[PDB]
Amino acid sequence: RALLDDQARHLLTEQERATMMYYLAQYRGGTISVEAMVMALFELLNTHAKFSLLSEVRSIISPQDLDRFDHLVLRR
């Protein structure tokens, strides 16, 4: 959770960081699927540098959801 929070602070505004943390908490809370979370992040992460945050997000999602995450989020 530290590698992501550190990276988000450098690449996102406070408001954009609040949006990312909101969707991540909705996903962790079981309200939304990993796919709904990914789609929300695609709407938030508009620049090339911002897209790099999804590799940090990958490290904090449930291991059983990694294949679904990778199916929508390009790994390299």
30 token code pair: 């079981």
Torsion, Cα 31 33 34 35, to 10 degrees, reads -130
Q: How far apart are CA 4 and CA 53, in angstroms?
A: 7
Coil, helix or strand at residue 47: coil
30: left (phi over 0), alpha (psi -120 to 50) or beta: left
In contact, 5 and 57? CB cutoff 8 Å:
no
User: How far apart are the C-alpha atoms of 37 and 56, rounded to whole Å?
Assistant: 14
Alpha helices in 1-76 (DSSP H): 2-11, 14-28, 34-44, 48-51, 53-58, 66-72
- Tokens coding 33: 């699927």
Q: How far apart are CA 60 and CA 36, in angstroms?
A: 16
Question: What are the tokens at 71?
Answer: 């199916």
Q: How was this model experimentally determined? A: X-ray
